[PDB]
Structures are given as structure tokens and as C-alpha cells.
Structure 1
Amino acid sequence: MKIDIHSHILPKEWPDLKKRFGYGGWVQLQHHSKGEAKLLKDGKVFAVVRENCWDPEVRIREMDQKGVTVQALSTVPVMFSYWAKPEDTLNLCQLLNNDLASTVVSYPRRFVGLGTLPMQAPELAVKEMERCVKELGFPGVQIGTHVNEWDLNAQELFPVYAAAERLKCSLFVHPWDMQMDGRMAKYWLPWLVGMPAETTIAICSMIMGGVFEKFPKLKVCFAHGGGAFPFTVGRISHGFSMRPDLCAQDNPMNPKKYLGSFYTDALVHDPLSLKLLTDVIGKDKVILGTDYPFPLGELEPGKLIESMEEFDEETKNKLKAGNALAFLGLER
């Protein structure tokens, strides 16, 4: 019900990428029947999306109706494409970022853009970041919770962080590329459980990798209330204290010292979790985020926030829009 930091969109169409690049494993969007499109990844329909996933005029009507003022638009994490050749992911990121830039310029009072990067190639990612910031005007980018066998602690990724820091370019971290098969194939576990564990790992990798210590001005927001982190910080903090040989090897400060140093969205569904999220992360560091237009997201944006009896107005306004603005470096 003011700013939604967490929302995904696709271009309506893009060229056959297998043809474009020479190898398969990409996703396309097919428009078969009305107000619906199939996402495929070699072979199968991966997911069905409705027109709010591509048509910004539809997004505006839904936003008007829900009282959402601005959505920060980012691609669908399936498009990250960190597994492809570096130049080809770059080519794709340019197409998705421009398309994103084009939607934003059409409604620059209702949308901001969070771009995508070829993270598997930190020199290309820096360049594409500069362009997103300087040429495209995006306040930030969305990145995966990991990049192939790299976690957010990886040294290779360090230039990317120094660039983001320097460019005043915010990072929205989104869990992606969990295990989808084996034990994880049933009960939508990769989404229910594997996503919040991915995020929990990412936060851990960034704290214990020293990322926040190297780059104290890096602005970073994690997805879904930081996964399990706000609840298991005790275990993480105490275990860090207990086994510095395994945990304090790169950054000697206890994880608990970085509570306050990063943001999460507020997408945790119940009041008790939200209250704990703010207690643990702080009321300046939690941002309304919705996962629009996906069904695992908040159906009525901001409704969980508005219903918290304990929060005064100032707090509610922080969580709905204020914190978003600090995290993006923009003005109301």
C-alpha cells in the first residue's frame, strides 16, 4: 500500500534465444490463448503467467486498486541465466534492462527499475551495472542468492560490490536456483523451504565473507524477510562464537553486529513473523515487498503491515514506503 520493492515482470516477447546464441536451456514466453502465456524451458511449460506479468497497463490498474504507488520492477529470477556463456547472458541482460528501462520511462512516477547482470562474469557485470545506473537511471539491481558454485562471499564477486558501492547502486538479493528434484520434488518445497534457506545462506555468506565490512556503504536487501535468518540468528551467532576456526576465518565480527546493516522485504505472511523481523532487523531496515504477480506473494499489498496493532503510524509509514526510499536513495 505505498512502495512494493519486490515485483517481477517480463517483456511481452523476445527472440528465440537458442537461435540467437546457439545452444538451448533458455526460457521463452508463448502467447497461445487470451490473457495468459506459457513459460517454457527446454521441453515443458514451467509456469503459466497472466497479462499482469508483462502488460504494464494492467499492472497500473491492479496498483490503483490495491493502493500501491510504486512497484520496483525486476525480471523473473528464472531469467538470471548465470549458467550461460558470459557474453550471451550480457546480451540478454541488455535486452531485459532496456525493456525494463522502457516500461519505467512510460510511468516514472509508478515504477523504478532493478536491473539484471551477468554475475558469472564480474567485469561484464560491472559494465552493465554502470550502464544501468548512468544510462538507464536504475537505482539498483536484483541478483541471485548464489552464482553457479559461487556464494556471495566469493572474492571474484568483490569488484561487482565495489562498483555497486561506488555507483550508489542498491542490491536486491533474490533466492534462485535451489534444488528442484530428488527429495525436493514434492510439496513445492523448493519455494516453501528451499527459497528461504537460499536466502539464509546468502546472508551468512555475506556476513562471514566480510562483504559488509569491506563495503560499509553497500546497500543490500534480502528477499522474503531474509529467509530463516531472523529466527536462526541465535544459532548462527552462537555457533560463530563457538567455532571461529570454521566461521571467523574471513570476518572476525559476530554476525549479530551486522543486524542493522542490511534490509529485508517484509514478505513473511504472519504478524508474529513480521514483529520478529522488525525486532531483529530493525524498523528502518524492513521494506514492503509483495512478489507480485506471483501467487506465493501478498495478495493484498501492505495489509499485514496495516493490521499490526502495536506499530504506530510512523513505523507503518517506514515499512510501506519510507524504508524503500532510503534503500533506493530516492525522494517522495
Structure 2
Amino acid sequence: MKIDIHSHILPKEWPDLKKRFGYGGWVQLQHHSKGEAKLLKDGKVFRVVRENCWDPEVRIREMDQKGVTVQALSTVPVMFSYWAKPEDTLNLCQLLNNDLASTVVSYPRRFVGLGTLPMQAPELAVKEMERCVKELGFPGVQIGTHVNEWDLNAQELFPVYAAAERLKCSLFVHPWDMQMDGRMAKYWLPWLVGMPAETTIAICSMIMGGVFEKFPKLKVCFAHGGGAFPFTVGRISHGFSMRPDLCAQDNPMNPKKYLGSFYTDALVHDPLSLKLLTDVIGKDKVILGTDYPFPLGELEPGKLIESMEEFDEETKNKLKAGNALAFLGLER
């Protein structure tokens, strides 16, 4: 009921990305009937979205009703475009980052921005992060759980973290690009399961890959309660102890030690799950996050947190605000 770290927005419209770059596979936004807009990935309507997804005044209005002071705006993860030619992805990012900056400058007390980067091109990414921080004044950027074949361990992605740490730029890691075919192609599994597992895979890839060790000041936040992690860190930190040959290759420390090193959002729905998340990550490293305006998100922002009979005043207002404030590097 204060700060929302996990929300997604889209320009009302953008150019024919196919026309613009010369090849296909991009997404376009069709406004056909009123109130609704169809997202197209060449051919299929892959998701239908309402006005709140592109129109800030509509968002301020829903925010006002739900008591939410500020949303951190990031793009829809499908816009990452990590696959395309680096200079084309970078062109998109500058356009989505500019649109993001336009929305913030208009309600700077209601929004802050989390940019996207052309991650497949680490040098291009690091340039947009400078521009995003010095020019646009973004506190941080939102990034995928993996860049094609690279997981958040690849040393190639090291120029980006070194940048983020120097630029005091936060990192919100979002699962995306799950497997969508075959056995996941049913029961919404790509989303109920495939997603938390991408986040588990990334949290693992980072710790064991040494990143938190190499950049002890790189501030990270993972989506969806950290995925399965808070419950399976026990298994994970044990397999680590049992096979240093498979696991301790790049970073000797036990995963159990980076607990308290990173944040997650509190999007876990159940109160028993929230208790554990704070139990295991710290009442200081958990951040309210809604997946606004998507349905798989928390419909009543902060409700789960102000129901916790376990939590007192300073802890609820931490999970609801101060943690966000701390992670972004802003202040009341």
C-alpha cells in the first residue's frame, strides 16, 4: 500500500518494428475495440491488455484507489528482444526507455523508471545504462533471467555488473522466455512453474558464478519471491557441500551465505509463503511487488502484507516501502 517494485507498462503505440529493422519476430500493439489492445507476436494475439497498461492517468487512478504511492515502471518482458541484432535491440531500448522517461517526468512523485538494455551486446548495454542513469535518471534497469544461452553467470555479462555497481544502478531480474512447448504447453505451467524455476536458475547462476562476490555492491532484486529458492535453498546449499566439483567451481562460498545479499519481491500470494520468504531472506530484503496490471499478480496491493498478524509496524512498513527505498537508492 506504498511502493510497488514490480509493474509493467507499454507505450500507447510504437512503429512497425518489422518495417523498421527488416526482419520479423517483433511485437506490435493492436488497438481494435475500445478499452482493449492486442499484443501480436507475428501472427498470433498472444495476450490481451487493458488501458491501464499504457495510460498513466488510468494508472494513477487505480493507484489512488489501492493506496499505492509509487509504481516502478518497467516494460513487459516480451519486449526484451534479447535475440535480435544488438543495434536493433538497442534502438528499441532507447525508444522504450524514452517513453518510460516521459511517463516519469510527468508524475515524478508517482513513478520511477527501470530501463531495459540490449543484454546480448554487453558493450551496447553498458552505454544505455549510463544514458539511463545520467540522462534519464533511472534508479535501475530490469533484466531477463537469461540472455539466450547465457545465464547470469557468463563472464561476458561481467562488464554490465561492473557498470551497474559503479553507476549505483539496481537490478530487477525478471523470469522470461520460459519453455512454452510440449509438456509445458498445458495447464499454464510455463507461468505457474516454468517462471519460478527460471528465477531459481538465475539466483543459482549468480551466487555460484561469483557475481555477488565479484561485485559486493551490485544491488539485485528477483521477481516472484525468488521462485522456488526460499524453500529449496536447503537442498541447493547441501548439494553444494556434497559436490564442490560440480558446484564450487567458480565461487567457493556456500549459497547460504549470500542470504541477505539480495532482495526479492513479495509476490507469493500465501501468508505462509511470505513468512518463510522474510524468515529466509530477511525482513529487510523483501519488497512489495504486484505484477500490475497482470492477473497472475496481487489484485489488492499490500493486502497480504497488512494481514500478517506476525509482523509489527516497522516490519510491514519496511516490506511496503523502506526496502524498496533502500534497494533503489532513493529516499522518502
Query: How far has the Cα of 1:265 moved from its partner?
Result: 0.2
Partner of 1:194: 194
Query: How far has the Cα of 1:69 moved from its partner?
Result: 0.1
Q: TM-score, normalised by structure 2?
A: 1.00
- 2:275 is the counterpart of 1:282: no
Query: How far has the Cα of 1:234 moved from its partner?
Result: 0.4
| Aligned counterparts, 1:22-61, within 5 A | 22-61=22-61
**What secondary structure, in the 3-state scheme, does the structure 2 residue paired with 1:216 have?**
coil
Query: How far has the Cα of 1:308 moved from its partner?
Result: 0.1
In 1, distance between residues paired with 2:140 and 2:285?
16
Large movers: runs of 4+ above 4 Å:
none
**What secondary structure, in the 3-state scheme, does the structure 2 residue paired with 1:141 have?**
strand
Query: How far has the Cα of 1:214 moved from its partner?
Result: 0.2
In 1, distance between residues paired with 2:149 and 2:123?
18
Percent identity of paired positions between Structure 1 and Structure 2: 100
In 2, distance between residues paired with 1:69 and 1:298?
16
**Cα deviations by residue, 1:250-281 (Å, 9 ceiling, x for unpaired):** 00000000000000000000000000000000
**What secondary structure, in the 3-state scheme, does the structure 1 residue paired with 2:180 have?**
coil
CA RMSD of aligned residues (A): 0.3
Query: How far has the Cα of 1:283 moved from its partner?
Result: 0.4
**Cα deviations by residue, 1:96-126 (Å, 9 ceiling, x for unpaired):** 0000000000000000000000000000000
Query: How far has the Cα of 1:245 moved from its partner?
Result: 0.1
Partner of 2:269: 269
**Cα deviations by residue, 1:273-306 (Å, 9 ceiling, x for unpaired):** 0000000000000000000000000000000000
Gaps of 5+ in 1: none
Query: How far has the Cα of 1:4 moved from its partner?
Result: 0.2
Query: How far has the Cα of 1:80 moved from its partner?
Result: 0.2
Query: How far has the Cα of 1:32 moved from its partner?
Result: 0.5
**Cα deviations by residue, 1:101-159 (Å, 9 ceiling, x for unpaired):** 00000000000000000000000000000000000000000000000000000000000
Gaps of 5+ in 2: none
Query: How far has the Cα of 1:40 moved from its partner?
Result: 0.2
Query: How far has the Cα of 1:25 moved from its partner?
Result: 0.2
In 2, distance between residues paired with 1:71 and 1:302?
13
In 2, distance between residues paired with 1:322 and 1:267?
17
Aligned length: 332
**What secondary structure, in the 3-state scheme, does the structure 2 residue paired with 1:274 have?**
helix
- 2:238 is the counterpart of 1:238: yes
**Cα deviations by residue, 1:3-52 (Å, 9 ceiling, x for unpaired):** 00000000000000000000000000011110110000011001000000
Q: Going by fraction, where is helix more abundant, 1 or 2?
A: 1
Q: TM-score, normalised by structure 1?
A: 1.00
In 2, distance between residues paired with 1:86 and 1:181?
26
Query: How far has the Cα of 1:174 moved from its partner?
Result: 0.1
Query: How far has the Cα of 1:73 moved from its partner?
Result: 0.2
